[PDB]
């Protein structure tokens, strides 16, 4: 029954409309959902706008009138210039008249701000179309009408606010460059009159709602108006005093003054400098007397969240940081301005204590700006000595966990603050530590915070001072551990002790005996069952090693052998209680140390000793696994194998090229294992179906395959001897993985294969052209068929696929030349297919492959393959690129689309395509590709965008083609085109903007 309004043959029943609307907004459930779909269908009607006058007149429902304006808005924005000229005038006068009537009724003006604001925005859309060329008297008449009524005046400020927004703040990529400039100049030319009205309202008072609306419009003006309107008038005085007293105007005023601080201003005028100081002085004055004193607890105030206090304190922070980041130098010389400077910063200290993450980040960015300046600028730091001292405590007390962005920001400020006064920093931290011991500030969180802070400033003190400091801290922490009872409390402190020492490698390096004791203690903690301790022990171990590895590989004076040997001897005992992941980290850390041994014979010996356990386990497996291939069904054997390989990955990760001897030890048997595991997976899928891939059995088997691929990939990506890679590793690898991948069903294919191959082609692709051909043959077509039915299925294969094609196109383009014509055609289809992805991992590679492909073809010069490529695929790439450029569903790839298109168009206008791109039938013999390109494109756009005039298309292409050497301008023209296709009757002269 509600679907009656969708019948335009009959007169629209306003009563029925309001019922549908109410059912949607105030209703619920199915009735609401049904009304929703009815309303959408209504406003989507391209003739609904005609029945807008009815609604706005005869309706009593504000939401219905709102929807009516939305329908009108859509018309004005897209089809305005298509209407008969009479309709344009009619709609205009109807909107003006409607606004005037709503303003004259105090009841309506008071209770329907939403409908009025919408009507105003709708008026602004008309202005963007009609003003000033067909409405020169708008601003004069606006100013005139303002003097008669307060309500009308206030509403005009809303219209001018919205107008300023649409022209200056949101015009980019909503209107053409030409249209934007036109409207900007128009507003600029008549602003003198607007400002006069604005200033009179502000100075003469006195309606709160009128003042606020005026100030809100002023905020928008300040984004673009010349500085003279602010400094050559008394307006700064009004903002910084009068309007800071009343809370109604205080919020908006503070936002205005923030933007005033960002105005473009000459830096040589001494009078302007005083004006800039003055309004700051006045503002801080009003805050101290009307809002709160400098001593006030803003943390508590913000927490209470009374009224608009949180927004105000946010705005105050933005104001202070903005002004001071730019102008604090104005306050640093004059002794009469010192109190002001420090009060402003004292407010910032208090703000910095507020518990609010995003606010803290705002103030912290300012503090960074300050202390960095004090670090470099002569004769400044003494001014802020008391501010900096407070700041040290504030930052130390709010230090966050390092794991990260906020921590690094905090670290930088605190390091600066430590340089500025090492003595005060040390004192605060020791004092803080004392209050952890007496229990006055003791907590798990508080001791962790202090530890992170103490750890963050390592390498800032002198070595001697650092040594004294570190020792004092560890002693105090050690005593704190003994004090506590229960493993929980003792565990927190013990972990913090290990954290701090791990952060002071310079100290550890200088004191071997202590370093040894630390490592030995970590080894003890690797047996601790208490939750988190083992993870902590391993993470600290590798962290210390990364920084102190040299002290593990050499013989210390009081030692018989390098400590790395001692670690390896007891490695089974040390790691006996660790989880597999933790063991791998341990082995990885050992690999870091071994890599520092530059004696090859010694390095390889250490490597062999380290890998003793996994190699023995490995040898035992290879024997048992091959004799009885059924062993691999055992989940325990599969897990053992996976962990052995993972251990090799871990060590290979830290040793890179040095890992080769260990790789050669297992390589051939590993690939044999790869084959055996592959057979079982296939056998399992055959016996149980695709569901088998989901079972723990097969997932365990595929893990072995994936880890093997990862190990080979890891080594090859870091290999220095590429001759050995090519002549020993590649051929067995390809024989082991390619056919298996090709001949498995889609759900059993490992995307890791593609990834591994990408690395192979990357590092040695230039040396194995036959190898690359074999890779394409085995993975190209069968992978493409997996991903070319939709954009969702096989996401990993999707990404790795185009990464592989990309590197092949870069390193071994010959491989594509050897493809049969039918396969090269699929290659092109695959690239365009990548364009249409929203998935940026695919889209970006797709566009890059396209770009690099064109370049590869270009370098071939005038040869048959290059000529046939252009004949076959040039206009395919031009049109496909144009499609994603204009379909509004690939805006993320605009820049690379533009670059590709520009490159394609440039080929023709530089005459780099030797052969004609046309048939001798469709075009007279002798026609340049340049002329034919224009015809093809003109025709293509005409059919794709039939609502465009031939003149638009001609002007667009004329501009586009002659700008194909300048990318920024080229892109501008494309964006102008994307605006014009969204409406009817776009001006073709817009494309002459550059």
């Amino acid at each position: 029954s509600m679907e009656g309004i969708l019948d335009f043959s009959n007169d629209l029943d306003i009563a029925l409309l309001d019922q549908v609307v109410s059912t949607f907004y105030q209703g619920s459930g199915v009735q609401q959902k049904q009304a929703q779909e009815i309303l959408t269908k209504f406003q989507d009607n391209p003739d609904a706008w005609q029945k807008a006058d009815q609604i706005l007149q005869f309706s009593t429902n504000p939401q219905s009138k709102f929807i009516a304006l939305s329908i009108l808005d859509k018309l004005i924005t897209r089809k305005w210039k298509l209407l008969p000229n009479d309709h344009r005038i009619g709609i205009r006068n109807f909107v003006v008249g409607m606004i005037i009537s709503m303003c004259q009724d105090d009841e309506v003006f008071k209770t329907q701000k939403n409908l009025i604001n919408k009507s105003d925005l709708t008026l602004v859309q008309i202005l963007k179309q009609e003003w000033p060329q067909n409405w020169p008297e708008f601003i004069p008449e606006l100013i005139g009408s303002s003097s008669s009524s307060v309500n009308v005046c206030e509403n005009n400020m809303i219209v001018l606010k919205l107008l300023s927004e649409e022209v200056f703040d949101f015009s980019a990529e909503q209107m053409t460059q030409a249209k934007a400039l036109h409207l900007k100049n128009s507003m600029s030319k008549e602003f003198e009159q607007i400002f006069k009205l604005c200033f009179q309202v502000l100075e003469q008072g006195s309606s709160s709602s009128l003042i606020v609306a005026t100030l809100e419009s002023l905020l928008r003006y300040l984004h673009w108006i010349p500085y003279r309107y602010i400094y050559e008038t008394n307006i700064l005085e009004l903002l910084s005093t009068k309007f800071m007293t009343s809370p109604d105007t205080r919020a908006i005023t503070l936002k205005c003054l923030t933007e005033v601080s960002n105005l473009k201003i000459p830096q040589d005028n001494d009078l302007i400098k005083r004006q800039t100081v003055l309004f700051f002085q006045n503002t801080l004055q009003q805050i101290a007397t009307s809002v709160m004193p400098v001593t006030a607890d803003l943390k508590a105030t913000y927490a209470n969240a009374n009224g608009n206090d949180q927004s105000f304190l946010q705005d105050l922070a933005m104001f202070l940081t903005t002004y001071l980041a730019r102008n604090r130098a104005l306050l640093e010389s004059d002794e009469s301005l010192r109190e002001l400077l420090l009060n402003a910063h004292q407010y910032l200290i208090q703000l910095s204590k507020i518990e609010e993450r995003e606010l803290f980040k705002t103030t912290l960015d300012y503090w960074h700006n300050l202390v960095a300046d004090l670090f470099y600028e002569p004769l400044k730091k003494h001014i802020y000595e008391e501010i900096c001292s407070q700041l040290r405590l504030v930052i130390i007390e709010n230090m966050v966990r390092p794991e990260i962005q906020l921590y690094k920001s905090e670290r930088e400020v605190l390091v600066y603050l430590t340089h500025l006064n090492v003595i005060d920093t040390e004192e605060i931290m020791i004092s803080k530590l004392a209050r952890q011991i007496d229990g006055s500030e003791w907590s798990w969180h508080n001791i962790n915070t202090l530890s992170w802070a103490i750890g963050s400033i390592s390498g800032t003190m002198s070595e001697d001072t650092e040594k004294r400091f570190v020792v004092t801290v560890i002693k105090d922490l050690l005593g704190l551990c003994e004090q506590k009872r229960g493993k929980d409390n003792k565990a927190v402190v013990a972990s913090d002790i290990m954290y701090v020492v791990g952060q002071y490698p310079r100290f550890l390096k200088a004191h071997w005996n202590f370093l040894r004791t630390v490592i030995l203690k970590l080894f003890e903690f690797m047996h601790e069952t208490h939750e988190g301790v083992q993870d902590m022990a391993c993470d600290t171990f590798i962290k210390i090693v990364q920084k102190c590895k040299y002290h593990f590989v050499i013989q210390q004076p009081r030692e018989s052998e390098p400590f790395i040997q001692t670690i390896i001897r007891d490695i089974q005992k040390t790691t006996a209680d660790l989880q597999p992941q933790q063991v791998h980290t341990f082995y990885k850390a050992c690999g870091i140390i071994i890599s520092e041994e530059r004696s090859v014979a010694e390095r390889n010996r250490l490597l062999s000793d380290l890998m003793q356990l996994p190699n023995m386990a490995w040898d035992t497996i290879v024997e048992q696994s091959t004799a009885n291939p059924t062993l691999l069904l055992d989940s325990e054997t599969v897990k053992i194998i996976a962990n052995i390989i993972k251990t090799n990955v871990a060590v290979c990760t830290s040793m890179g090229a040095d890992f080769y001897p260990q790789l050669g030890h297992i390589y051939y048997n590993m690939l044999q294992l790869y084959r055996a595991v592959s057979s079982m997976i296939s056998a399992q899928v055959a016996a149980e179906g695709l569901i088998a891939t989901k079972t723990p059995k097969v997932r365990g088997l595929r893990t072995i395959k994936k880890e093997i691929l990862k190990l080979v990939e890891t080594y090859i990506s870091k290999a220095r001897n590429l001759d050995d890679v090519v002549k020993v590793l590649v051929e067995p690898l390809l024989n082991a993985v390619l056919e298996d991948y090709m001949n498995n069903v889609p759900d059993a294919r490992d995307a890791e294969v593609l990834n591994c191959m990408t690395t192979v082609v990357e590092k040695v692709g230039h040396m194995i052209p036959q190898g690359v051909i074999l890779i394409l043959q085995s993975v190209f077509e069968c992978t493409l068929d997996m991903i070319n039915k939709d954009f969702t299925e096989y996401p990993e294969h999707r990404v790795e696929f185009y990464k592989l094609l990309k590197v092949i196109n870069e390193k071994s383009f010959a491989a594509f030349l050897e493809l049969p014509p039918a396969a090269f055609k699929l290659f092109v289809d695959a690239i365009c297919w990548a364009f249409k992805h929203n998935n940026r991992d695919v889209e970006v590679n797709g566009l890059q492959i396209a770009l690099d492909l064109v370049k590869n073809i270009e370098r071939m010069g005038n040869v048959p393959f290059a000529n046939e490529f252009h004949k076959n695929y040039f206009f395919i790439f031009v049109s496909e690129t144009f499609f994603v450029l204009t379909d509004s569903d690939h805006k993320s790839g605009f820049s690379k689309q533009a670059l590709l298109l520009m490159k394609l168009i440039s080929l023709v206008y530089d005459n780099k395509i030797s052969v004609p791109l046309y048939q001798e039938a469709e075009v007279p013999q002798g026609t340049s590709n340049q002329v034919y390109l224009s015809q093809y494109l003109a025709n293509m756009l005409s059919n794709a965008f039939p609502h465009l005039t031939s003149e638009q298309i001609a002007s667009f292409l004329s501009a586009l083609t002659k700008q194909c050497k300048d990318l920024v301008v080229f892109k501008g023209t494309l964006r102008d085109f994307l605006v014009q296709i969204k409406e009817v009757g776009g001006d073709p002269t817009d494309y002459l903007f550059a």
Partner: peptide, 13 residues
């Protein structure tokens, strides 16, 4: 969680 070894190493400097 005793760490007598740590103190001894610290007192050794």
């Amino acid at each position: 969680f005793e760490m007598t070894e740590f103190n001894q190493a610290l007192e050794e400097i």
